[PDB]
Amino acid sequence: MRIGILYICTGKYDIFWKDFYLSAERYFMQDQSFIIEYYVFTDSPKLYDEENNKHIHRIKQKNLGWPDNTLKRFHIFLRIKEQLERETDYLFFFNANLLFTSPIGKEILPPSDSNGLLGTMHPGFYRYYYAGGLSGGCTKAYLKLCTTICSWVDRDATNHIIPIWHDESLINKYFLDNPPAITLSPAYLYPEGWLLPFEPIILIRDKNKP
Ligand SMILES: [Ca+2]
Ligand SMILES: [Cl-]
Helix, strand or coil: CCCEEECEEEEEHHHHHHHHHHHHHECCCCCCCCEEEEEEEEECCCCCCCCCCCCEEEEEECCCCHHHHHHCCHHHCCHHHHHHHHHEEEEEEEECEEECCCECCHHHHHCCCCEEEEEECCHCCCCCCCCCCEEEEHHHHHHHHHHHHHHEEEEEHCCCCCCCCCCHHHHHHHHHCCCCCCEEEEHEEEECCCCCCCCCCEEECCCCCC
């Protein structure tokens, strides 16, 4: 199975790519039968390891700023939907500062007989309240999610300068209408420094490097 990773790091966010990437190579879908493609939307002229690893697909993306950079997240993915349909069976979006800390495998893949969607519980809320930092699914289902959310944003994009929507309320509305096949615990979006019962699986990195 071909697993596509969607990753936006415009502007100063590109600093998070190297360790996200290294941790993914170490921990994400370790079983060599899986083939991972990285789709990295950035204004950076060159990403770490890009010259060595052709699974790293740098996609040219203008730096956007509030509200657009997260508000237009799904618009950004859809620019290459044709490429994504031909090259992937699954798609997962990870916020720039996420870091894998332990092995993740096929348990996060929505089965083909499900609605094909994955969402993640917001760590602050531990009918779920979903966080925007991690979502995904089979390629066809996730692209339908993108198209739907894109349509909602576009309703206001011209006439409303101040947005009504935010990427997070958008994903919560989507998952309300379409309860995802898989809902991951906040262990997959564990804010560094927080007191939560479980062990972190994916960490939201804070500002201090070890
Ligand atoms: Ca830290
Ligand atoms: Cl691999």
